[PDB]
Amino acid sequence: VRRPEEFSHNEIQLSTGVKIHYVREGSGPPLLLLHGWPGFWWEWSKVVAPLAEHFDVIVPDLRGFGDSEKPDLGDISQYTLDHATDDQAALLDELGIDEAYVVGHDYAAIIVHKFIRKFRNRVIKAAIFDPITPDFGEFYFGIPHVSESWYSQFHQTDMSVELVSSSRTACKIYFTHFMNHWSYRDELLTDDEMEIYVDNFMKAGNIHGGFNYYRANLSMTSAPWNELDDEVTDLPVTILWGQGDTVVPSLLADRLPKYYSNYTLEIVEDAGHFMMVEKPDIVIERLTAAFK
Amino acid sequence: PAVRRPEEFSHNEIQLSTGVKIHYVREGSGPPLLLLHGWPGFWWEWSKVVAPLAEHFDVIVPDLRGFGDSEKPDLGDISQYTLDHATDDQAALLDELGIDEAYVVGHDYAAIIVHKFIRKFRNRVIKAAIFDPITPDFGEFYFGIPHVSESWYSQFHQTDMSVELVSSSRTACKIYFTHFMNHWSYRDELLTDDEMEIYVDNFMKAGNIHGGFNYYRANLSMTSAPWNELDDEVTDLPVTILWGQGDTVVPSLLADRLPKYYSNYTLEIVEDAGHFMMVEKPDIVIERLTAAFK
Ligand SMILES: [Mg+2]
């Protein structure tokens, strides 16, 4: 287990008005790895050094997460996924990168979906794990998947922030459920690993900032998708799907042709929602091979 | 120390033909009147209306199985937490008290219990009243869009983590339940802090958190069917319906569904009341029940 401090840390101010934290190492074509919720850059820790043999690996914290800036926590409008998508192109800008390989899942599955249609000329190839497409809502908020999406509505309440942040123990109890339930195997993280997550989420504004994503993009009056996002894209895309993902299940894969005309699909039977945590060997091999 | 303390009632615990030990308080002289709580709650949610009602009724206020000081059936066996069981418990309690027929009042989970009781045990009801009723119709709306913004908690309770988090301390327990007491109420703050501490005292008892959540696992999981073909019966029992317009979880726009199941009822929408009519507007409860049950 390679700890957060055993990485090379950076912080820069982007044109989008927000300060973004990221780690970086390796040499080669740029490779941007984007986390979701629950998460922050460190969820990719198992795969950074191996990929750094072939890529300039760049792993930022999304705004509202990790050590990146939390916009005014009372301003839900700064937590749209469109903002976080613009943050990624502005990061490449600030680093003098013309185009990059892009990888995302969970919330970052939407960012990548948006990114390669709005910033097509900034992406070489892309990969998405357990992708989420504009037609996801009808299922996600439907019967019986409401059994799984309840947390998105929990996070609209002020009491959710108050309860989850009431102590380290309450924080660990809450987040431990999603890491395991959304995973193929019964226990995803070692206790020490989970403790590093609690360290992260007990940072000022991180519980609140993460829930604002749900208030900004998954409320009953939220409209996070754009007309642009309905475009079929012919970008070469690598799709991996964890058959164990209970919240974004692999059966939704029959919807990919609605939006992608040139993709590979691999359903991993013994993986769930966190491919880079549970099956890092696979993430490493397929990205190295797909990205030349 | 500003409301009738829970110690200041006449308590009794009784084993029933159904196999559970039921706890209840009782006082008053008159025709019998059974008052049934829901979630979050226990017998003491009716405490503001018991003594005023006890001047004309024989008030009987039990803890539902899984709640309060009533027995928790095996917590790993959700089959013992269906609303059919809790309805039978009410008849079993009348039996054990020598009561042939009673006035009956229910809301929330007890709104369902009453719906079933007045159809299966019509022989045992004089008249009934339901606050913010819940009909067999309910699921399509409760789990529909956008009400999933309000029913998330029913699915939260399916998880093991919900029990682990909410029982983690008095603080967590109080933060959690405070949300529902207030959010489901017309006014911003339903309970005084001292009243809330009594609620926390109750839910920090062994199995009261787990047991309450089991009602959601037995009756409101996606594989549940708590309703029966009988419950589709249209009943002509005279039913008093009071509806809090500020109720966010069982909203009063649902009143158009009542004729589907009731042919002899009164309806009054209370503008400045929410999900807990007997807590937020105790006077209306007292005045309406005493008027209807004469
Ligand atoms: Mg699992």
Residue numbers in the entry:
A (entry chain A): 12 to 303
B (entry chain B): 10 to 303
Paper text:
Isobutylene (IB) is produced on a large scale by the petrochemical industry and is metabolized by the aerobic alkene-metabolizing bacterium Mycolicibacterium sp. ELW1. A gene (ibcK) encoding a hydrolase is in a putative IB catabolism gene cluster on a ~222-kbp megaplasmid.
The α/β “core” domain, residues 1–146 and 229–303, is composed of an eight-stranded beta sheet connected by α-helices. The adjacent α-helical “cap” structure, residues 147–228, consists of five α-helices spliced between strands β6 and β7 and oriented perpendicular to the core domain. The active site of IbcK is in the cavity between the core and lid domains, as in other α/β hydrolases. This includes the three active site residues located on loops of the core domain: Asp 117 on the “nucleophile elbow” between β5 and α3, Asp 256 after β7, and His 284 after β8 (AD1 Asp 197, Asp 248, and His 275, respectively). Electron density in each of the IbcK monomer active sites was built as a glycerol molecule, which was added to the crystals as a cryoprotectant. The electron density was modeled as poly-carbon as a placeholder (chain K, residue UNL).
